[PDB]
């Protein structure tokens, strides 16, 4: 563990060493080479308990990576619903793009993560915003053949129009 960074501890879900390394030094929001916080590493590897612990101890969920990667997008991309809910409850932006033109919703749709798609839409993610190529989240779900996802999105759009 001496060899492991705080990021790696968070990724592995090593709560004990992680908690110790935080007392030793104020490193809770210390970014690695790519701008990733311990929280982003934890979110990316689905470590719910570590995410809870870091957020309780002041980890900032709005900090972004070098390419504007977010903890939210990392979690969405892998379908870690419980982590998505925790971050959303912190009031992060749900509609922001990174440099690779991805948004949380596009990553959820790309990974066929239906519960994540539903949760994002309920928190204000807009399925009509487009990539630089002109396609939106509905388009992508159709393109990829993810029918349960297409239906969640369409149902959402329809209910907006039906009030």
């Amino acid at each position: 563990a001496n060899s492991l960074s705080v990021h790696q501890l968070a990724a592995q879900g090593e709560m004990l060493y992680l908690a110790t390394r935080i007392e030793q030094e104020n490193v809770i929001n210390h970014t690695d080479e790519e701008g990733f916080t311990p929280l982003m590493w934890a979110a990316a590897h689905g470590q719910i308990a570590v995410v809870e612990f870091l957020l309780q101890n002041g980890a900032d969920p709005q900090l972004l990576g070098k390419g504007r990667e977010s903890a939210l997008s990392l979690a969405c991309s892998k379908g870690y619903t419980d982590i998505v809910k925790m971050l959303l409850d912190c009031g992060v932006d749900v509609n922001e793009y990174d440099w690779n033109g991805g948004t949380p919703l596009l990553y959820a749709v790309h990974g066929n993560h239906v519960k994540c798609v539903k949760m994002l839409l309920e928190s204000g993610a807009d399925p009509t915003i487009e990539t630089d190529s002109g396609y939106n989240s509905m388009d992508l779900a159709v393109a990829l053949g993810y029918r349960s996802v297409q239906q969640v999105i369409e149902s959402h759009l329809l209910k907006l129009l039906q009030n």
Partner: peptide, 13 residues
């Protein structure tokens, strides 16, 4: 690796 996000399509369609 640093965790990474998947590459999305540059066009669909």
């Amino acid at each position: 690796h640093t965790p990474r996000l998947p590459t999305l399509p540059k066009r669909v369609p």
